[PDB]
Design an enzyme around this catalytic site. Structure first.
Site, short mmCIF file in Angstrom:
data_model
loop_
_atom_site.label_atom_id
_atom_site.label_comp_id
_atom_site.label_asym_id
_atom_site.label_seq_id
_atom_site.Cartn_x
_atom_site.Cartn_y
_atom_site.Cartn_z
N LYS A 72 -1.18 33.25 39.46
CA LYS A 72 -0.11 32.28 39.28
C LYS A 72 -0.03 31.21 40.35
O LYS A 72 0.57 30.16 40.11
CB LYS A 72 1.25 32.96 39.14
CG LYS A 72 1.39 33.77 37.86
CD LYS A 72 2.73 34.47 37.79
CE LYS A 72 2.72 35.72 38.65
NZ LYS A 72 4.00 36.48 38.55
N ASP A 109 9.25 32.26 34.34
CA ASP A 109 9.89 33.34 35.09
C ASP A 109 11.20 32.86 35.73
O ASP A 109 12.22 33.51 35.66
CB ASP A 109 8.95 33.88 36.16
CG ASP A 109 7.74 34.58 35.61
OD1 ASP A 109 7.88 35.33 34.63
OD2 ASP A 109 6.65 34.39 36.22
O1 LIG Z 1 1.73 40.43 31.30
C1 LIG Z 1 2.93 40.27 31.07
O2 LIG Z 1 3.64 41.09 30.45
C2 LIG Z 1 3.56 39.01 31.64
C3 LIG Z 1 3.98 39.07 32.97
C4 LIG Z 1 4.63 37.89 33.71
O3 LIG Z 1 3.72 37.42 34.71
C5 LIG Z 1 4.98 36.75 32.76
O4 LIG Z 1 5.33 35.58 33.51
C6 LIG Z 1 3.86 36.50 31.72
O5 LIG Z 1 4.16 35.40 30.91
C7 LIG Z 1 3.72 37.74 30.79
#
Ligand SMILES: O=C(O)C1=C[C@@H](O)[C@@H](O)[C@H](O)C1
Ligand SMILES: NC(=O)c1ccc[n+]([C@@H]2O[C@H](COP(=O)([O-])OP(=O)(O)OC[C@H]3O[C@@H](n4cnc5c(N)ncnc54)[C@H](O)[C@@H]3O)[C@@H](O)[C@H]2O)c1
Ligand SMILES: NC(=O)c1ccc[n+]([C@@H]2O[C@H](COP(=O)([O-])OP(=O)(O)OC[C@H]3O[C@@H](n4cnc5c(N)ncnc54)[C@H](O)[C@@H]3O)[C@@H](O)[C@H]2O)c1
Ligand SMILES: O=C(O)C1=C[C@@H](O)[C@@H](O)[C@H](O)C1
Lengths: 282, 282
Positions: A72, A109
């Protein structure tokens, strides 16, 4: 009626509920929707660089991606544009890919946790809050807290350096000294004096049983939040509820990050109750 | 109920009916299905090497690809496995991607044209056939013809070298002298003596109006086929039908290549009438 193609780039994605949420909601709005895990620990994508995988999605006709750990932060310089919030946080979880391949990074988020506060803690007192945990999701939570009315946030992490780095990032993002790193040791006395506390550590998960601090410091007047979403009722939230505290469970952020990303990816207004339904059904 | 992800790698793909056929049939069998064009003339994929695009599909969770011009020969060495027919032809139009990323090439142009003969010319006399045109689709058509009962196929192309190369490839594939290259000049006399003739040239399309040979050489006893599928009733097939000839229109191959690929990609038994419906609706 055009079909929608999405994925998630990250590590260890088998249990993610995000693909199901997006596939079901696309279909509910009359769009066949594929949402693929792009797991660099798995058989398809292992060993590939983030840039390779991002470029692949562009070439293949993806309309959007989510990005999770450990990518990220790394993703930002690879994108054409990044929203102001994601830029200042230094973290993108959502990449909108335009018809012709241009990428814009966003952070849902942050928006998702903020929406969860509005939805599940509409009357909460926000003058002084403590957050335990400054990792990955904790950065977004902290930014959300102080942009959705928290006047002073004290962030504790076992790694003091992580908490202080968080504080610097957020304070720069907002333009005030909203956040202070505080020691994890003795955090109970800090929480006792605060209006609310949020767990942003793994504690409460089946593999991390217990709480990040001694719940005897809670009072009936506190509110309590948790990022952990399985179980929904963590030991921490059980203890809070026993005192009559308002609580914010981790499903709200997990659902709303997907609500907000779906809107960004598609331009459609997602149905929150349907996406919540899907999340809870898994 | 797992979603299905497919695409087509090639040039100039906007008008392809293949994506719609697969998306509709997946959905009809309770699978959300995305089928993307991967057009190296377009904004997403231009300038990328075939290998880059194939690898992208592996990393991203595609379950299969079709391959069209100019890549149906180039793709073979990039694949893990190639069917015996596609290997001997030297042309793959269908790539099955296993759960874990392994690729197998097939040729459903061959199987599709053959199925079209069975479906639309079940009683045709096959001892001697002429094919006009030895390009791209003509190679698959010729292989299909001589594997579905044609004893002697005479193939004419303006480029004699293309016809003779075709003949060598097919004859090696089958293990007999099934195919002979013949001159395009004077092809009418060759057709007049044959049982049937197939157009494998662009003639009959709106941008190539007319016929590849003088239709006065046809008789009521001939059958006539055409690869062109828009219009469905080409000038050639009109002339044949006027004499009472059985005709094979180009939609049969275009539909059945997709029927056969869908089966390979998914392991599901496609509904031919539904896929035909979709094709005709576009
Ligand atoms: O793998 C997941 O369940 C996710 C985790 C987070 O990082 C979220 O921000 C992502 O969009 C989905
Ligand atoms: N609600 C949601 O949408 C959502 C999404 C993803 C993850 N999560 C949850 O968030 C949790 C944290 O995720 P992360 O990726 O930031 O993890 P991380 O391991 O990167 O960060 C957790 C932090 O907690 C600190 N910590 C652990 N125990 C502590 C304690 N007793 N006191 C103070 N600090 C402590 C660690 O030093 C670490 O910096 C995950 O375990 C997961 O349960 C929630
Ligand atoms: N039914 C289907 O599924 C399907 C699929 C794709 C393409 N097509 C059709 O097939 C046609 C041929 O496709 P291709 O990619 O092989 O094209 P191509 O241009 O590669 O090959 C056509 C061949 O016809 C020859 N030719 C042209 N006019 C001739 C004539 N009068 N006499 C002898 N030879 C002649 C050319 O020299 C050339 O080698 C396309 O124009 C398209 O209409 C049908
Ligand atoms: O682009 C198209 O319409 C197609 C053309 C042929 O090459 C086919 O073999 C391919 O599967 C689909």
């Amino acid at each position: 009626n055009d079909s929608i193609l999405l994925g998630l780039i990250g590590q260890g994605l088998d249990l993610s509920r995000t693909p199901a949420m997006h596939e079901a909601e696309g279909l509910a709005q009359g769009r066949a929707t594929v949402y693929r895990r792009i797991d660099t620990l798995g058989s398809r994508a292992s060993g590939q660089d983030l840039k390779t995988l991002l470029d692949a999605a562009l070439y293949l006709g993806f309309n959007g991606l989510n990005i999770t750990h450990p990518y990220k932060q790394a993703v930002l310089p690879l994108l054409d544009e990044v929203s102001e919030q994601a830029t200042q946080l230094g973290a993108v979880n959502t990449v909108v890919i335009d018809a012709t391949g241009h990428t814009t990074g966003h952070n849902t988020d942050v928006s998702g946790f903020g929406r969860g506060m509005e939805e599940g803690l509409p009357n909460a007192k926000l003058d002084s809050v403590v957050q335990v945990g400054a990792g990955g999701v904790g950065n977004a939570v902290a930014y959300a807290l102080v942009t959705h009315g928290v006047q002073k946030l004290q962030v504790a992490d076992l790694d003091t350096s992580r908490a202080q780095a968080l504080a610097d990032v957020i304070n720069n993002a907002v333009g005030r000294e909203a956040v202070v790193g505080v020691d994890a040791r003795g955090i109970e006395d800090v929480i006792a004096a605060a209006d609310g506390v949020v767990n942003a550590t793994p504690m409460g998960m089946p593999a991390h049983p217990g709480t990040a601090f001694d719940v005897s410091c809670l009072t009936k007047d506190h509110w309590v939040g948790d990022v952990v979403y399985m179980p929904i009722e963590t030991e921490l939230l059980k203890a809070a509820r026993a005192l009559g505290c308002e609580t914010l469970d981790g499903t709200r952020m997990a659902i709303h990050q997907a609500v907000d990303a779906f809107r960004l990816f598609t331009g459609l207004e997602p149905d929150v109750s349907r996406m919540r339904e899907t999340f809870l059904s898994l």
